[PDB]
A = this chain, B = another copy of it.
Amino acid sequence: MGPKLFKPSIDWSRAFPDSVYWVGKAWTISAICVLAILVLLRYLTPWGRQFWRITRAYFVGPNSVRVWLMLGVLLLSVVLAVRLNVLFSYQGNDMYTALQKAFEGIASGDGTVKRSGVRGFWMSIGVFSVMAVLHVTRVMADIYLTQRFIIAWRVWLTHHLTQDWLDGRAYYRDLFIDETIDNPDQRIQQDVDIFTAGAGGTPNAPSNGTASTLLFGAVQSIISVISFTAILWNLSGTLNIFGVSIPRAMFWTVLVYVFVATVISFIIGRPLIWLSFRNEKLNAAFRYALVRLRDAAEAVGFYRGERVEGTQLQRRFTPVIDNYRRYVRRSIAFNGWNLSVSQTIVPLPWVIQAPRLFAGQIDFGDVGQTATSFGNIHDSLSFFRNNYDAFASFRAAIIRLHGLVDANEKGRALPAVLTRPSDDESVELNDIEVRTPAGDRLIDPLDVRLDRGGSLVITGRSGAGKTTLLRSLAELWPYASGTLHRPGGENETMFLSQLPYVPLGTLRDVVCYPNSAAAIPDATLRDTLTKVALAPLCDRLDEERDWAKVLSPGEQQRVAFARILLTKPKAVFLDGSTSALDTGLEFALYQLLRSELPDCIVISVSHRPALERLHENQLELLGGGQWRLAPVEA
């Protein structure tokens, strides 16, 4: 080995025109190699067929051009990060060689090699100072670009998923299907945030880049393997251990040590899916037991039952803390193997290359590159076993959403009562039988016809099929049969409930509930509030406090007689609606209904024997199935 000076590894001049063609070449290969694996994952996979049923309409259509145009920049922002990782490795090959040429000039004595080794050190520091700004600039323009995507995804998904909950009265007929969902108030608010925001377990924090995401963190660990496998191939040598001549030992060793140590870490973390799904189910049945106590806080204070409610509230907190203690005991046997494997491989490229260095074969430059390339194809093939604890919690957020999407298509396939429009203006019903979900009987087939000015009173016992007749004519009860003829329209058939109801907003929205607040003028709302003796509420039409705990139940049944004078229906049904009003105010509220609307089919359910002298006919339920119709004898 004669006197050789210092020569660089890569020509640092013409390094920017060469790293502008490699990026443009590696982008178009990966753009058609990524789009051929997701097609193979939409089929042939049980968890890939449930990802596409939820969010299909966001990626296809005419309004899905700005989605792919923003998804195509995040691949350039990963290829540009692999290229800098290679150019950082090319510089430590120069610095450790320049630090070796300076030591062989001091001990030898000459000053030609030393002056060529000193000048090679101050060159390989100025290259580090230019490639340290392009790292900060690339990192900080990558947090901002990936937080504008998982916001606009979440805003679309939680708006599309709610129209699917209240489309065909599917929020009420989900109690009769065979397999029922637990609570759909949590899978819309919280679970969409875990589903859309990349890494599983937690909702997103405003510092999550693209390296903490289970898609773009996996397509980096393939380009980082393909781009590094041409450096480790021509830096290893023949190894003899048992008389077997292995040609490239350090390259075939790392592909055996990972494949064996991976398949043991898939049978340890196998039951880790059904322990992270039960942690969201038992934690969302504890919060519902506290909200139900909040809006019923007067009846608990009346009964003084604050000690029985301290037991049915503690019976739901025991299995949410007994399940967590075995979720902890499984994530130590899983995290104790992936660290004990990765720790006993770090002195391996220092004990194979070290006998080849003390003899004159290599020159201390390629030891500092073998120590980097071996610790970078090992940190990229160990992505599929280091991040299995954050994928098994992401697979338990597709099941919860797929249950909600599945249990609304079986909520619109249950049978109901067929409804047809009338001939001119009539309410006639041909044959109706109503059953009980256990299989009993309530009402035999009956035939009723009303005319344009008729009336009807339905009377009977206290617990025999009286409200569930009206729950069948409103298309809400599945166990029924028959047909109905109605004066159909938009709001030309009004129903009223037995227990009163008030919405959330201001009092102007409480007064006219089925219509909007802007479709009713201001000048007509202050006169109809004085016919129902609701005088002192002419102010306070712009307040915000909750009216379910302020308005007494004798004033929530006079508001319900003001929603019937503004909508102007034709065939209004009503049950109850005089449970709190006394006689004198009850008789004064039906004369107004007969004097304002001159021709409406009024059907009213009642209990007190002072309303039968106002209507014309009468239907009586004997209980057990038998009905009896008779005209008002008067």
Contact = CB atoms under 8 A, between A and B. Distances in A.
Contacts of A154: 321
B308 A514 contact: yes
Interface string A458-472: 000111000100010
A102 B363 CA distance: 12
Interface stretch (A23-31, A290-298, A375-383): A290-298
B102 A358 contact: yes
A57 interface: no
A166 B609 contact: no
A26 B96 CA distance: 39
A207 B184 CA distance: 30
Contacts of A321: 151, 154-155
Nearest to A313: B162
A324 B609 contact: no
A308 B552 contact: no
A503 B609 CA distance: 33
A306 interface: yes
A327 B155 CA distance: 16
Interface in A319-371: 321, 324-325, 327-328, 331-332, 335-336, 339-340, 343-344, 346-347, 350-351, 354, 358, 360, 364
29 contacts: A100-B103, A107-B107, A125-B347, A125-B350, A125-B351, A128-B347, A132-B344, A135-B343, A136-B339, A136-B343, A144-B328, A154-B321, A166-B309, A172-B301, A185-B287, A189-B286, A207-B331, A207-B389, A291-B291, A292-B504, A298-B476, A303-B501, A308-B509, A312-B504, A312-B509, A462-B554, A498-B553, A579-B580, A608-B608
B121 A151 contact: no
A45 interface: no
A312 to B, nearest CB: 5
A14 interface: no
Interface stretch (A228-236, A581-589, A594-602): A581-589
A202 interface: yes
Contacts of A607: 580-582
Given A151-B328, A175-B549, A299-B497, 19 more contacts: A103-B364, A108-B108, A121-B354, A139-B339, A140-B336, A140-B339, A143-B332, A144-B332, A171-B301, A172-B297, A185-B294, A190-B287, A298-B476, A302-B495, A302-B497, A308-B509, A308-B514, A462-B582, A463-B554
A205 interface: yes
Interface in A478-506: 491, 494-499, 501, 503-505
A188 interface: yes
A205 B331 CA distance: 10
A201 interface: yes
A58 interface: no
A505 B312 contact: yes
A496 B299 CA distance: 8
